[PDB]
Amino acid sequence: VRGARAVIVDLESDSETIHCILGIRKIDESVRIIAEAERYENIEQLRMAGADQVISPFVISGRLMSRSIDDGYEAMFVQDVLAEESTRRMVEVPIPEGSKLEGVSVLDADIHDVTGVIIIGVGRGDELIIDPPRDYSFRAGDIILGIGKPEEIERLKNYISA
Amino acid sequence: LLLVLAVIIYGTAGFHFIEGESWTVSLYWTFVTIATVGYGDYSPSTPLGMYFTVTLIVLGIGTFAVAVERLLEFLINREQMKLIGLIDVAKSRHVVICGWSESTLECLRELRGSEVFVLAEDENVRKKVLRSGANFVHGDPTRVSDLEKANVRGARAVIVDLESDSETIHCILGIRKIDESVRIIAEAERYENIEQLRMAGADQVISPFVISGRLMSRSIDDGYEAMFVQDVLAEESTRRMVEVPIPEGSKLEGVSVLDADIHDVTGVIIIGVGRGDELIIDPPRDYSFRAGDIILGIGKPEEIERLKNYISA
Amino acid sequence: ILLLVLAVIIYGTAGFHFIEGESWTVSLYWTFVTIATVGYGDYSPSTPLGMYFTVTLIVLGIGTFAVAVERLLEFLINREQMKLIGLIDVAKSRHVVICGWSESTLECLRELRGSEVFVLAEDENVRKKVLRSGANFVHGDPTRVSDLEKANVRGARAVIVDLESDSETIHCILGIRKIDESVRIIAEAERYENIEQLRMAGADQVISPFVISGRLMSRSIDDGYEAMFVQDVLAEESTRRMVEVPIPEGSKLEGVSVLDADIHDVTGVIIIGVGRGDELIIDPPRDYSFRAGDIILGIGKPEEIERLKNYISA
Amino acid sequence: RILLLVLAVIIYGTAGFHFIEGESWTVSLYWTFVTIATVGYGDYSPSTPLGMYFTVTLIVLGIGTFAVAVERLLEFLINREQMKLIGLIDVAKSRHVVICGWSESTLECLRELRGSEVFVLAEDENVRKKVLRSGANFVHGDPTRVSDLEKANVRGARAVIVDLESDSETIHCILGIRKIDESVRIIAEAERYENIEQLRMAGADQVISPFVISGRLMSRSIDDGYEAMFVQDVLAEESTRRMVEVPIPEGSKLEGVSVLDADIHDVTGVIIIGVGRGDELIIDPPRDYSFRAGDIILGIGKPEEIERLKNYISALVP
Amino acid sequence: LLVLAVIIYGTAGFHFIEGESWTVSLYWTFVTIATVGYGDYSPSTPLGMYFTVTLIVLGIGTFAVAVERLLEFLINREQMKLIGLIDVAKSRHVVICGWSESTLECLRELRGSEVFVLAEDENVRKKVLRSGANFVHGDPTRVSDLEKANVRGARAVIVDLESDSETIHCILGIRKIDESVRIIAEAERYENIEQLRMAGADQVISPFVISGRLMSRSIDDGYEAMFVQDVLAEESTRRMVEVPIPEGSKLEGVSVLDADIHDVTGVIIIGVGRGDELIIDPPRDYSFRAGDIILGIGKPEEIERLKNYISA
Ligand SMILES: [Ca+2]
Ligand SMILES: [Ca+2]
Ligand SMILES: [Ca+2]
Ligand SMILES: [Ca+2]
Ligand SMILES: [Ca+2]
Ligand SMILES: [Ca+2]
Ligand SMILES: [Ca+2]
Ligand SMILES: [Ca+2]
Ligand SMILES: [Ca+2]
Ligand SMILES: [Ca+2]
Ligand SMILES: [Ca+2]
Ligand SMILES: [Ca+2]
Ligand SMILES: [Ca+2]
Ligand SMILES: [Ca+2]
Ligand SMILES: [Ca+2]
């Protein structure tokens, strides 16, 4: 575990998951820990134990269920963007240092028009802004969350450099 | 059954001759002496009745105790028949949940405010279900006679998560033997049986472990992928993900989405557009909006309102 | 449910109001006595328009009341608990919460005779023993936070945690630290291999009895006095009690070295250790300067306990 | 019995090579050992077809018997371990310790008995792996069956330690021990307080009730945990203070000397928490306790000041 | 069939591919396949060095096929063939269906007889061998498995299974094979001793009924239970023996009182056996017929005396 890229933890019960996480942090207190949460009631308890990211697939499912009564496009969206069988892949693209976009407003940049990548969100460290407002200034090192074909991602990666 | 009448008629005789009452006065006495009401309109007027008073206390008590249990059971099935009568009017809009899992629980928490029935084979869940806000129906969701007990026919939709995928499939078949048109949403424990669920009549299928495992993998490098899905689904964020329908005879029918500049015009992100039973993610620029198309987008509730107007005639 | 109770009540007060000719006051006491079989006597059927209405109202009213009386008591077992549950408005370190029912938490409870303690357990049959040991019982999963709140862990004296596994024990502690993050948490550890994990979760004090027992065993091979001591001080059968004594501000001992203080000579109380915050020094050196607030750990007779308690004040 | 049959194929080959090709008693044995062990050096091939039959059948049937010897040899590799074990049980003047049951306690006990001869006896086979990495020998057997207590050489052991799954089984084991060595020291863990006496009735010398200890420490740790901090810290070797039992030899400078007259804490710095008279211990002895010979002094102190008590206590020179 | 494959490939590749006789070419195959590889026929041409590797593989498969299948078959066949030619086997064997504490304690008294245990639980195998009996893994209710214990032509079959139903089910299966072989069966409930006999149980022993009655009789004084348990152990010097009255007896027609057996031989006559029924404490005027069976307690020395006192 020490000198691992990350550790993914899904054990039979949430207690055992936690108990595992604490043990990890008693070895490599910085290695990335991703953990599955069976109950919503203890997402926070998992994070307290040192879980860096927490995915609770039953909470996702139930909410997708409810949204799939009227029309199922919500659940259709989530599942298809995540399969590489869909040509649209969901990629995180970094803004290089000394960017052509540093300081450029997202509206001034017209990324959707320029590269065809849909900007679903923009990442500032460990927090994410979905559908950024028009007046969001691109800083360097921001992370772009987007959907697009592999060809139009390569275009954004060039459009973003110095 | 017939034994309850025996003590009643037996009392009407010991008051008809042994206390000097009519058949109508003796019958009204026996029904009150059995319920220990002792209102008082007929007390033993002769020691042949005061003897009959002591003796009928045993015979009258037995008829009262047996009748309440059978009538309450007949009032509990009638309450089951009267509770069944209330779901039929609410039925053009009710939702039936087959199985009680963590998935179906968190779905129910987002259906706060609808007529919902949970059907589960384990009884102790009833307390949890009621403190969660739904009606409970004890039954095996594979037996059709219990699906009928939840008025699955003519429901808004039925949601199905059972212990295994085999039971889930079996249940869907039971539904389609009642309402072959009701919307069926079902979770699949294994990816290996998504198609089998759809073959059996599942209209929409959600596989949360495939969602999970994939978010896990994408959370190693950077966790924004997993962060996106989970946040769009909580109603607490100002960005809501809404399906917007394109009315017939729209300002957009035949208008290209590139000519529409919807993100530019209304600020709503267009992540996909739906034509019937399929959804196209990041639609191409030259997609003609037909009538009835569904717009899948994220946006502020204000800029959603702009999309709803910008799309009309 | 409550619609059946209104039926016998409304139909009887009306069937005596019109079908027997009574006021609302005579008909309701008629229905309330005819349905409840009280038969106080203020309204019996004086006409067969009532004698028919009596039997049908009393039968339907006796049957509807019988279903309703239990429903009221079922609401009176939870709502009378809800008025008593509403009564815990103290904002004080009064009660003690014990999470889990093991043999340890039983032996602990037997030494808390005279205190108000709450046991929180997921297994229901435990209720009989808990009451016969002197505590109140709360049915709930001590890992669920909404059930920790059912024991008012928030603003408790301390919480004691022994669950079936160490994983469950940890999970509970983390939940506690999500309500009252300062309450003292005492937790039992089944494996030595994860004591640190228990403290990481927020347990202030951790007791691992298999390590105690294992170590006492090892020491009882040759001669058993090591084990004999630990078990004997903890039973009140010895006249010697083991007490923690604090050093107040303005002591006759404040700043005085323990050798110059010569506590063993002065008071006869054995000084096995002195406590500084969250750490303890056993058999302190002769040249230990007592600071204020130090805790003195000692064994002695109840008479000589008072002497050290006097010797330390102004 | 079946393994006893394996020796036959070698001799039949030693017979099938002695006459069917004309070899001596010395030549017949050297031929079979290469044909059966598949070494096949090659010094004897069929010079008449009558030998190729007796060779091939005896080489094949004997080769199967040669391979079978490994299983007996693996048993023979356990008997050579018995010749090395005989050298270790006579290393010093202390004999071995038997641990009946594998609990978390006996695991923690075994970990502090590093350096004594220890044998664990448990009916669970998978326990064997943990026992070896914990440093003791394992014996697969039911510690209630006496024929399996005997398999752990309980007679003439230093002591036997008993923690079984239930208190009932523990008792049965103790009684089993006492049907062999009615004097060997028996230490037993008690899972319920309700039957300590029953454990001693069966012949248990010392009984440890870790739930009674623990339950009581909790009750006392609510306010401040120095009590519990004390017990656990005296028992870990990480603290510099050791808790030692010191005996008062016959004819001591202290025989007849009061514990107050001895000024032991002042003289030696060792804290005297108790003194032992046989199978009972007096905690915080009264000021006028007369030290007799053979009494045991229970005290805490640094290794240097332990040395001080050991001399201040010793007997006068002849 | 695998042994023939390497044999055919090897005995020809040394007869033709290197020039050896029919006896020399096959002798090459038998050592190279068993990896003995003595060496008297090695590849003298690469045409043999090529087939050597293939024959080393093909011969290894036949050697493994010959070693695993034949040696297991050579250990069980050696038990049936060496027993037939070296020394004789006294009488037919015994079958024990089920492995309980009863059938275990039964085996302790059949030390030195050919016994076969049939039980469906495999791990029982080791204990049975160290008890001195042979083991057969099978369900004693399935008839095809009773056939596996040679029930037919057994001396007797002893049946104690987990439940009384399974015991019965077993008994009926036996009688569907050897409808005369002696069947002894343990009864867990008194309520169905008769049902066991209906199924064909010749003798029925119900050890819990014995125990309970011994318990009750052991309250006042325990000599009853002391008697039963000690007469049955050979640790007691008194053994309980069945002695037959030979044809043309010295006692035939002699009253038991006229015979004074207790006085004459010291054997206590606890009962006398007339076929499948037993008379306990016979009356004084019981005439000894020939072939009657005497049930008695005595030391081994005084039994030999009765056996002489009883002859012609
Ligand atoms: Ca999982
Ligand atoms: Ca929808
Ligand atoms: Ca695009
Ligand atoms: Ca599920
Ligand atoms: Ca990523
Ligand atoms: Ca926007
Ligand atoms: Ca415990
Ligand atoms: Ca010792
Ligand atoms: Ca003292
Ligand atoms: Ca234990
Ligand atoms: Ca304290
Ligand atoms: Ca010192
Ligand atoms: Ca049995
Ligand atoms: Ca008796
Ligand atoms: Ca005799």
Author numbering:
A (entry chain D): 175 to 336
B (entry chain A): 24 to 336
C (entry chain B): 23 to 336
D (entry chain C): 22 to 339
E (entry chain D): 25 to 336
Give me lines lifted from the publication on this model.
MthK is a tetrameric ligand-gated K+ channel, related to BK channels, and consists of two main parts: the TM (pore) domain, containing the signature amino acid sequence TVGYG of the SF, and the gating ring—a large cytosolic domain with Ca2+ binding sites. Binding of Ca2+ ions to the gating ring induces a conformational change that expands the ring diameter, which in turn pulls open the pore-lining helices. MthK consists of a pore domain whose pore-lining (M2) helices are tethered to a cytosolic Ca2+-binding module, known as the gating ring. Here, we studied another K+ channel, MthK, which is closely related to BK channels, at a wide range of AG openings (~2 nm range of the TM helix separation) at positive (depolarizing) membrane voltage, and we found that the channel conductance is tightly regulated at the SF, with the T59 residue, which forms the ion binding site S4, as the key residue.
To further determine whether the missing linker segment may impact structural refinement and AG diameter, we acquired a crystallographic data set of the full-length MthK to 3.1 Å resolution. We then completed the structure by extending the linker segment to connect the M2 helix with the gating ring, and refined against our data to an Rwork/Rfree of 0.228/0.275. Here, we compare crystal structures of full-length and truncated (pore-only) MthK channels, to find that the AG of these structures are in distinct conformations, with the pore-only AG forming a narrower cavity than the gating ring-tethered AG of the full-length channel. Consequently, the channel’s conductance is regulated at the SF, through an allosteric coupling with the AG. This idea is supported by crystallographic evidence demonstrating that the AG assumes a more open conformation in the presence of the gating ring, as compared to pore-only structures. A88 is known to be a constriction point in the MthK cavity and is important for ion conduction. For the AMBER force field, the position of this current maximum (i.e., the level of AG opening, quantified by the A88 CA distance) is very close to AG opening observed in our crystal structure. In the case of the CHARMM force field, MthK shows the maximum current for AG opening slightly larger (by ~0.1 nm) than one seen in our structure. Maximal outward K+ currents are observed for AG openings almost identical to those seen in the most open crystal structure (up to ~0.1 nm more at the level of A88), and in a very good agreement with experimental currents from single-channel recordings. Available crystal structures of MthK show distinct openings of these helices, making MthK a good model system to study potassium channel gating and the AG–SF coupling.
